[PDB]
Design a protein around this ligand. Structure first.
Ligand code: MG
Ligand code: MG
Ligand code: MG
Ligand code: MG
Ligand code: MG
Ligand code: MG
Ligand code: MG
Ligand code: MG
Ligand code: MG
Ligand code: MG
Ligand code: MG
Ligand code: ZN
Ligand code: ZN
Lengths: 91, 104, 53, 206, 36, 100
RNA sequence: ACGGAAGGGCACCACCAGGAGUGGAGCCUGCGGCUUAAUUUGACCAACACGGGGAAACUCACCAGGUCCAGACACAAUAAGGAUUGACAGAUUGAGAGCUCUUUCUUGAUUUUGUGGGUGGUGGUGCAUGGCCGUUCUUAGUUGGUGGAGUGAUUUGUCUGCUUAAUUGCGAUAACGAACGAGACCUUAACCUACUAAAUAGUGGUGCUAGCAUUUGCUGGUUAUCCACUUCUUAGAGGGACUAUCGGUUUCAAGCCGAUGGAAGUUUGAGGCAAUAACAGGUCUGUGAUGCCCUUAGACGUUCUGGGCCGCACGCGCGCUACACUGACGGAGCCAGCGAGUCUAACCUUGGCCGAGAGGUCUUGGUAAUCUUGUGAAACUCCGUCGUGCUGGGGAUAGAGCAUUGUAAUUAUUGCUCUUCAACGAGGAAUUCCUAGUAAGCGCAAGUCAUCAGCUUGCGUUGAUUACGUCCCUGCCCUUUGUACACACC
């Protein structure tokens, strides 16, 4: 996808600040309920890096559930330039 | 002439005024392609304007589009009709038939 | 482009869908179920709908 | 919200949670959820055969599942609490047995061997009857259906609602889908709730 | 078929979020920047 | 002493009656004055649907029912032993609303 | 398995006796055909008001067109003097679309270009499948263990006879003992001057209190106006029926038939659930169920505009309205039950006002045994007009106007007013459903639903005639029997 850098950073920071992302399968919703970003943007940034790994997705009645993995925590630490003590919220 | 208004007054009557002398459907719709003049005037006189194409079959004939040639879409093959004062108050789609006559 | 990429979907069959399978046809809109008739048959016992008579 | 719509939506939410945990905690042996509503918080008691994988390291998995359910169902943090307690008897849960047999067929085990393993385990776990139906292209063919039964099995009347556990799973093999149906008739004698015998069972004292 | 002609190495208006990198384009009477 | 009404709604009649009887016994053992438990007619939320997932076969219909049962008991009680009698009822499946 | 073989039993998806019809008319609706750019498509007892399929847009799958990638990601061919993104205005376009161009600004390692690999698909395959439904089959049927018979397939058990709705039982007996089905069960509809309890149900009497009558009585309002009670209502726990009692008749019982009592005596009525084996039955167009195949950037993805699904020489199925006086029309009488309904918001709407109507407007109550709602339903009843005529039956077709829903009513969404006033004079051969609160007539709620019922799912109102049988027709069950059938008499 071709998404703004700041919007991708908003999604990335919510992901490695809460641990889980729940996005409705609606590729036209203007705003994500939790994140001030396009729902399409959230969904596709995850159909993105969840494919390299770093996350696990479950569909479950038109509602994607993404959960971080260990490689996810490491990669997002590197991405957001965070010190190696800020564990995800789920920890 | 329309219902109590001659052609001369019609040609000068603005859409808003004309609506008041029009049946229930059209005036309710008004209570709820302006390039036409660009072919009405930007064309040689004593002749007809160039056709202006549109998909809007639900456009009501007002006495502002009188004289213009409109290519109405009926799903394919824009059909050119000349807006005449008898068309007033009718939908654009009433003059571009959507189907082919069966002819068993 | 993005301006003309959605027409009104505020009503009619295209506004709503099954909350399970996102199908537009056969929807159950009673009591706010908003479930396809087939999905409702599949998970009627989970919701609390049972056959007695 | 009206009471009709409230209770209907509560049932719908229970079904949503049930399917979510069915899809998520399959490999962890999920066996069913229960939603208790307390004035301060809602509690969701998960029954999974493995109540350590659902928890996770220091509760990581259960906390992330709580986060997922909060974010999906718009719950203020702290107002919902998942507790993975236990499945008291694995062999009596049709859902657990169906999931186990699906896992066995997926990772490779003969249909008859896996089905009779499930049937034998259920019967030795105190059940008064078990039946496993495997339907589909057992070996690439006309898609037969094989039944493997032990004990007896009433089907049906009211006693099937009373004590019969049925579960249906789709196993996705490289050649189509196999359908697994597991039916367990638990012993009415050790019911510990509801009627303790069949309606036509008469016991006399002397 | 957006081609975006290469446009090899090379004023201002209101809405001060336009931060002095918003040079105008001149065909004729063109007072509108890229943002608008 | 404030007058409050407790409304109990549930699909499971046995536990709804367990809660209503716990409330009545708690009001008697705390020596309150209560208008008896009124049982408003159970709402049968029925829904009719076609059994087949397609359009083939004999047109066989299927009625599913959700019987919702409702109860209200209103009485007069002070704050501590009204909070305790609304916090004693945490039986699963019964929804309880206390209105002042 | 079949038989234009036999015996026994059984069924208004069979008949007899009948009722209501359908088939004939107009229209509604589905199917075929024809037509079309497309008229998307599945289905041919067990397809055809079926796909919950009442499609203006959406739905949508079809057609004429126009966008976007929502082509992840390991990888190499583009990037740190720009890989890329977007766009005012004008051409262009249906389009106020940066689609593309005129053309120069904006943004900046997110993409773009090719390989590999994914992703979506209402694209194909229901003869590759899961699941689910339908059907065989609404019948009473089905199966081990051990024993008996047979070389064996297999058989007995699972049966002569009575009995039952029943492979239900009496019983008989190379079987014995069991399992499923039936039944039992569960839901519901009947009753209960019995229990518990009710300004979310109701009843009496006190307050206040309009009318009539005036010796205290009739009917009334008093929704914070008191007290008592639960007959009506509600819903918990229970009771009640077990063919009870008495006759008759059964081989010998199982049972059956009468009468009495009873609220109820046909499994008390109606359902829900419902075995074993199957069908190349339907569904890949419910599914983020799914294998394989196909396609994947000029898309079969997705979205937008417009059209189509409804198109009409014609054939068919479900239906609505009728053909009239057992009626139509006008007044007046004024009686249900099942239900549904809005808090992030526009749902059910009382009442006031405006309007001939539809409808509009101002409020109100209701998240509901509370308000809509006593849903003041319709048929029906009474009193009148009509007067037997295509008539004041019928209301098709059509013209004009007024409203409502909707972004949008043209191919008329629907409602309303006036006008027009077709066929139809009870319907051939055929053919359907039905045995009691049933048929039929009658409307109402719900489902779909922004709007749109002539549909369906339920509900109540009025309420017959006929029969209480049979195996003639069409079928079903058991047994015997024949078979050159086993893809099983198509
Ligand atoms: Mg039964
Ligand atoms: Mg006859
Ligand atoms: Mg008729
Ligand atoms: Mg498509
Ligand atoms: Mg098939
Ligand atoms: Mg033997
Ligand atoms: Mg035999
Ligand atoms: Mg077939
Ligand atoms: Mg159609
Ligand atoms: Mg329909
Ligand atoms: Mg022959
Ligand atoms: Zn669905
Ligand atoms: Zn600018």
């Amino acid at each position: 996808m071709l998404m703004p850098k700041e919007d991708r950073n908003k999604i990335h920071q919510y992901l490695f600040q809460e641990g889980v992302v729940v996005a409705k399968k609606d590729f036209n919703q203007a705003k994500h309920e939790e994140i001030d970003t396009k729902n399409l943007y959230v969904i596709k940034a995850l159909q993105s890096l969840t494919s390299k790994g770093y996350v696990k997705t479950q569909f479950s009645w038109q509602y994607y559930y993404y959960t971080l993995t260990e490689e996810g925590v490491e990669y997002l630490r590197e991405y957001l330039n965070l010190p190696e003590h800020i564990v995800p919220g789920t920890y | 002439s329309y219902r109590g208004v001659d052609l001369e007054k019609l040609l000068e009557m603005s859409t808003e005024d004309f609506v008041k002398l029009a049946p229930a459907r059209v005036r309710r719709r008004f209570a709820r392609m302006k390039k036409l003049r660009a072919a009405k005037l930007a064309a040689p006189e004593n002749e007809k304007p160039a056709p202006v194409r549109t998909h809007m079959r639900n456009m009501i004939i007002v006495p502002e589009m009188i004289g213009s040639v409109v290519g109405i879409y009926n799903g394919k093959a824009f059909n050119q009709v000349e807006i005449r004062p008898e068309m007033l108050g009718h939908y654009l789609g009433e003059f571009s038939i959507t189907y082919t006559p069966v002819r068993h | 482009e993005n301006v003309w990429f959605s027409h009104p979907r505020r009503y009619g069959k295209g506004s709503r869908q099954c909350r399970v399978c996102s199908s537009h046809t056969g929807l159950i809109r009673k009591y706010g179920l908003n479930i396809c008739r087939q999905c409702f048959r599949e998970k009627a016992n989970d919701i609390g709908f049972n056959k007695f008579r | 919200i009206s009471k009709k719509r409230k209770l209907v939506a509560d049932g719908v939410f229970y079904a949503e949670l049930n399917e979510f945990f069915t899809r998520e905690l399959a490999e962890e042996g999920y066996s069913g959820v229960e939603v208790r509503v307390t004035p301060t918080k809602t509690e969701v008691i998960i029954r999974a055969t493995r109540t350590q994988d659902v928890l996770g390291e220091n509760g990581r998995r259960i906390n992330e599942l709580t986060l997922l359910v909060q974010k999906r169902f718009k719950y203020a943090p702290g107002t919902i609490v998942l507790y993975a307690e236990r499945v008291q008897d694995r062999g009596l849960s049709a859902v657990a047995q169906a999931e186990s047999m699906k896992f066995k067929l997926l990772n490779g085990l003969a249909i008859r061997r896996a089905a009779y393993g499930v049937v034998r385990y259920v019967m030795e776990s105190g059940a008064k009857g078990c039946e496993v139906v495997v339907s589909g292209k057992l070996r690439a063919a006309r898609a037969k259906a094989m039944k493997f039964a032990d004990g007896f099995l009433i089907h049906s009347g009211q006693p099937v609602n009373d004590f019969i556990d049925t579960a249906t799973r789709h196993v996705l093999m490289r050649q189509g889908v196999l359908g697994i149906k597991v039916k367990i008739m638990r012993d009415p004698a050790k019911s510990r709730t509801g009627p303790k015998a069949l309606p036509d069972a008469v016991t006399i004292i002397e | 078929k957006h081609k975006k002609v290469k446009l090899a190495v090379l004023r201002e208006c209101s809405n001060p979020t336009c931060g002095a990198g918003v040079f105008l384009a001149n065909h004729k009477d063109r007072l509108y920047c890229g943002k608008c | 002493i404030i007058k409050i009404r407790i409304t109990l709604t549930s699909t499971k009649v046995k536990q709804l009656e367990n809660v209503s009887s716990n409330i009545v016994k708690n009001a008697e053992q705390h020596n309150l004055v209560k208008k008896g438990p009124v049982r408003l007619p159970t709402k049968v939320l029925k829904i009719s649907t076609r059994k087949t997932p397609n359009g083939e076969g004999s047109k066989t219909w299927e009625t599913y029912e959700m019987r919702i049962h409702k109860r209200y008991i209103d009485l007069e009680a002070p704050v501590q032993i009204v909070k305790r009698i609304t916090q004693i009822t945490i039986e699963p499946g019964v929804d309880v609303e206390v209105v002042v």
